[PDB]
Assembly symmetry: D2
């Protein structure tokens, strides 16, 4: 009684390899309504459906510059069905530009009882049905975000095991519906934890994640990993260098992530665009053996300059800013980026 | 960082003890739309909302004899807001007859990929919000049905641990919202597994369930257990007597269930009403030490006679039959029942 | 594939019941060579083999009415073959006095790598052969001492799971050789952890212990539990009354320990004779339901007085002191002892 | 509080890299007294130190053309203390020639109670001190053999997790004493299991093994993996090509073994020398990305022809046979071997 047939396995592996093809990354446009409301009010734009649609169309309808740059674009539930002003659907736009359609299938994080500010992620209800719907709607990969806080007694064993179990359930459902699941065990940089503590926490979290994936019979070749870079806390007084951070991140992935994983798509995790790009370039320049596609999956690290150059006015300046950021991060993913 | 405050624990314990009082059991009137349609077509009548309401009136609205025999009555999401033809809502009817309202908070059994027909339960999305709503609507306890099946390799480790984790999440959410969680780790009596194989499977399942409850900081004095009686599969050819079936069940509970659990409300997996009642009588007549209230949580084994004596035509005969069955099950819970 | 046959289970249950018969406790005379050297240099006398034989001489051969007070005595490998100077060996002495022989089968605690002062224990090598030998030598129950310390990040998940695993292996081997295994998850009282922290740690440790016992197919009716009293640290400022200590300890046991366990034989904790006795008396006076034999298993909490009165007396004064202590402790176990 | 300081980590990684330097495998010269008696009686000679030491000297003392062929040699306690014809200790004989000295630190397998013919390896008692002694004696790496059998209900969860726990304990102790631990989760080819079933079982076993290693804070860069080739059972009717065997084995390693592992040193598992060599060559010729040193750790697959050509003549022909077998196996581990 296998989980998937060879046809499903081949399809999932093909989708994952298309997503993490050399030099290709992920554009994280899956900002929920509240997050994008904060992003738009940071520049003064009002959070309306039309403004959201126009901003996401400005992001997605970029040029041949980002054509061989973005392996896949992840959208939201609303963004999947929205149409560009040209009249073409957003998944169709992404596919025409050579990308792969993705969608966040989270329902937000909920508190865990008995632990110090630790949250597990929900969204498993009807996930099979709505993942089949998204697959029919052009989506090929999904995203599940689980956050883990480094604190005095966190990430606790309960939070770690629960998040790993929930991620494995998400991945099982997505692979059963033909959707490539991107497992994101987010570890928040909020805190004073140093690089060594962050590396230890990432190692433990990813170990539990991959044990859960093995337990749930997840086809690892048809999955992607979306972990944060091993970085110090936001309150960390001790400054760690770029190559040191890259070595820590690559080592943490090496000690845990089996090579069957098609590729690793990092996140900015609240760091600046240039810092994220140089960190990814150093990671791909690490003098170790890294048997995955160490590529990027950036949100604000791709959108901050675009939003600043946009400001809400109805375009090509913001598009060019996003294009150059995407090109820089592609060169970082290829190891040939200069800050 | 505790899970519940002393006041929360005290009120949950009060609700639990009010549920499992000496003699008082649980009426499982939480038949979903499909199950109630199947029962109504078994008696031949049409499946309508008014037909369901009339069934619920037939069950809940009764005489003063049912009052000191039924501790709590669990309803459906629909039945929670339905009102009796008199005008009083069903939760207020249940409270007026001395009972306590219950709500089924499941969302079905989604299959587990990679397993031999093993299904995990869903319904955790928005469970906190809807449990707060149910608590405001009069519901003081919930129920979560997890299905495990004794096959040739099942219940597998994945199925057991996943169902235990899901039940623990359900229980944590319910206790956070002030609702007593009835954890029901159903092991289906489908197959030819002998009595002692059923005992072994039940022992493993309950051990995993209570380990998960401990890991999720579940206040066990504020929860109830709803397992099956340790019984052979319907295809088993060895016939085990009532006293030895009771011995097996009580031993299985004694080896896994900690005494903190206020009460064990037993389910009846296809048992006849009389057979389930005599099984409960034997269980409560077991010479071993049972530190829990071994009451009933019967559904079909409580209202099959009601269905037969009702037929669908608009009543008191079915009411009296249900009263007979409820009194028999109360005497069985008190260990003073005879056929 | 049952671990034990019905005859094996019956024998183990008989041994356990004889161990924890009403009012019958345990004397922990299993001090190792170094431990008894320190305990005898506390009075300053000596270490030599014969003079330490003379300790067990007056410990076991003291009165003729300690039979209804102490039911079993844990000895050492050395003490097993040591003889009373009259010619009778100590196992036969304890049998003649109505007791049952026990032997500690540890090999000391060893450090766990990567953690903060957490030590797992050895003794599993050749344990089957030496347990068969001890059964041939009259030993009917064993002992395993796993230590866990409460600190800033302790007991860790690794230490808890490893100690539970080694305890379960010990129990499996002992039950396979017909020896009743006493699982002792010693949670060391050093530190400043409060009562609530101690109770939480004890609950977690016992939950993992009993999950491991279930995983290793441990016959719980043929086992005993030897946990500590739920007591604060040596440096906890808050003063907790005896009945409150008892309520916490009994609640921690009820929340975890399944009723199948024959009895709970508490630890001395390194505390005073009178206060330990009244603590046990309060535990047996707790207004809850305790489905075990909450008896005593004390070392220095029965020895210190008979040590001060002995100091190398070559006798009856220390014999009488230990006898009066054991009588008071049996009275406490029966919930009758008055300080 | 890390398990190892950076100096210890560097030393362990250096030892591992020396062990699996390109083109170098491992000679599994270790044999318990019973196993070596069985071999020497199969060739017809007697089993005393006389022939045992001469056999070990035959194996280790060899031609200079085997120097880049064998990276490490796993020995026994006796063979560690035995000397060669020169009067020189076998550890030193292996050293200064290129080989790293290794010793099996098992104390045999002990049956697990409650399961169907499943065993756990013992040897943890005194492992720290005796590994320190082995380091003093020239040994730089160890070997631990855990046996898992594919059956109707096996490998059970208890057996898998217990073997992983004892392997992780062994590895932590060895890394504490500076010994590089070779984690060997043997899965017996005994049975009729299909190649797919063998791959599934190997996948689960390796996932559990590496989860345990992560839980015990094992430094993966300073460890070696010694798994069997994913091969059918002894009675599997379907014949599988060498390329198919290689693909299955490499896939099973990819899905579970993280890249931090310095190398993978397979075993014959009771197959012929030629079959083992061609299987290793196919594994190293697999068209996948394998971030480990896939080499050989062979016993009979390196010693059977040598022993048959020796027969107790007291030698050059046996030396030549073993040397040519080792040369073929090194060419296979380099991926450049043809019959």
């Amino acid at each position: 009684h296998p989980a998937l047939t060879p046809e499903q396995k081949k399809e999932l592996s093909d989708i994952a390899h298309r997503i993490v093809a050399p030099g290709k990354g992920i554009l994280a446009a899956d900002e929920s309504t509240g997050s994008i409301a904060k992003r738009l009010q940071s520049i003064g734009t009002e959070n309306t459906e039309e403004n959201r649609r126009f901003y996401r169309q400005l992001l997605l309808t970029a040029d041949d510059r980002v054509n061989p740059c973005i392996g896949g674009v992840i959208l939201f539930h609303e963004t999947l069905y929205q149409k560009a002003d040209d009249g073409r659907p957003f998944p169709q736009v992404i596919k025409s530009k050579g990308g792969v359609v993705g969608i966040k299938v989270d329902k937000g994080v909920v508190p865990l009882a008995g632990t110090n500010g630790e949250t597990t992620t929900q969204g498993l209800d009807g996930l099979s049905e709505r993942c089949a719907q998204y697959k029919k709607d052009g989506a090929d990969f999904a995203k599940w975000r689980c956050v883990l806080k480094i604190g005095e007694h966190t990430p606790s064993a309960l939070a770690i095991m629960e998040n790993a179990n929930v991620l494995a359930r998400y991945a099982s459902i997505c692979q059963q519906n033909g959707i490539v699941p991107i497992v994101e065990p987010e570890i928040l940089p909020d805190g004073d934890h140093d690089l060594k503590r962050c590396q230890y926490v990432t190692e433990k979290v990813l170990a539990a994640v991959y044990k859960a994936l093995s337990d749930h019979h997840i086809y690892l070749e048809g999955t992607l990993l979306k972990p944060n870079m091993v970085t110090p806390g936001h309150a960390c007084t001790q400054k760690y260098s770029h190559e040191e951070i890259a070595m820590a991140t690559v080592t943490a992935l090496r000690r845990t992530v089996p090579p069957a994983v098609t590729g690793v798509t990092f996140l900015s995790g609240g760091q600046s665009e240039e810092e994220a790009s140089i960190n990814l370039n150093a990671i791909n320049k690490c003098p170790l053996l890294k048997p995955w596609a160490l590529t990027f999956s950036y949100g604000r690290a791709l959108q901050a300059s675009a939003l600043k150059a946009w400001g809400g006015k109805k375009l090509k300046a913001a598009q060019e800013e996003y294009v150059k950021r995407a090109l820089a991060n592609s060169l970082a993913c290829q190891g040939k980026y200069t800050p």
